[PDB]
Amino acid sequence: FELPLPEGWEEARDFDGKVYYIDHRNRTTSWIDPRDRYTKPLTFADCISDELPLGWEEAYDPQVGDYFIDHNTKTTQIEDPRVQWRREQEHMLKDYLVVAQEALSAQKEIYQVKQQRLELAQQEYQQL
Amino acid sequence: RPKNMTPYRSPPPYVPP
């Protein structure tokens, strides 16, 4: 025994045989099984290990080969989005490391400007 | 992505019972 479609929903098949879901209450359709929202991780962060988050699909096409479908953003891509996500997380920490280095470097300059201003205030003052 | 990249296919239009 499986789990029922939530109230108002129906399952159907597109011309190519791909299953889709019909929400009669809101008069829309979706490639995403409405029961997935109770099971699947919502973001790549919540995934373990190889799982795809909600609204992502593997697909294939003879022209392009294996690719990925994101029903969340209504885009398709070649690159594995799980790989891409791990890469994005490292790049962000790298970026934060780099702006910390630049912030430190610029404050060193400010500090040195301030000690130059102290010297000038000393000169002006010792002119009495 | 390639130049012949498969574009996003939206789900079929809503249709009553």
Side-chain angles (χ1 to χ4, degrees), chain A residues 75-85 87-107 109-114:
Chain A
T75 55
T76 69
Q77 60 182 73
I78 299 309
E79 287 191 321
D80 191 326
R82 296 157 306 204
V83 170
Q84 169 173 114
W85 187 73
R87 175 196 311 132
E88 293 176 354
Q89 294 327 123
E90 156 148 42
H91 286 205
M92 232 187 44
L93 293 182
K94 180 53 161 287
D95 292 330
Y96 275 117
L97 173 59
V98 163
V99 307
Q101 297 167 348
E102 300 173 350
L104 177 60
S105 182
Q107 282 301 324
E109 293 191 359
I110 301 281
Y111 181 77
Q112 289 178 337
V113 163
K114 265 46 162 74

Side-chain angles (χ1 to χ4, degrees), chain A residues 3-24 26-36 38-85 87-107 109-128:
Chain A
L3 275 73
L5 279 178
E7 198 172 359
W9 294 80
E10 186 201 323
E11 165 181 315
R13 297 270 175 168
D14 207 353
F15 186 74
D16 64 346
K18 188 177 176 190
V19 60
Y20 66 101
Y21 304 89
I22 297 159
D23 183 353
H24 289 295
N26 301 275
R27 302 209 167 122
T28 183
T29 67
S30 177
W31 289 121
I32 307 171
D33 187 328
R35 290 158 305 187
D36 282 2
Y38 327 132
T39 323
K40 291 194 163 151
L42 270 153
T43 173
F44 283 96
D46 310 328
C47 293
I48 28 82
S49 54
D50 54 309
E51 31 186 21
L52 291 171
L54 182 64
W56 283 87
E57 258 190 275
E58 313 191 283
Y60 177 87
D61 162 281
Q63 332 175 324
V64 192
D66 298 307
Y67 64 100
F68 293 86
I69 306 175
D70 181 7
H71 298 298
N72 305 295
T73 63
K74 320 213 170 307
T75 55
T76 69
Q77 60 182 73
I78 299 309
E79 287 191 321
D80 191 326
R82 296 157 306 204
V83 170
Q84 169 173 114
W85 187 73
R87 175 196 311 132
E88 293 176 354
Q89 294 327 123
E90 156 148 42
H91 286 205
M92 232 187 44
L93 293 182
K94 180 53 161 287
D95 292 330
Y96 275 117
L97 173 59
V98 163
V99 307
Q101 297 167 348
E102 300 173 350
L104 177 60
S105 182
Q107 282 301 324
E109 293 191 359
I110 301 281
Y111 181 77
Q112 289 178 337
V113 163
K114 265 46 162 74
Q115 50 195 15
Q116 292 177 64
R117 283 231 183 75
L118 176 60
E119 296 200 3
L120 291 168
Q122 271 159 355
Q123 276 164 56
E124 295 208 295
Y125 184 73
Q126 295 180 59
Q127 284 181 344
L128 310 159

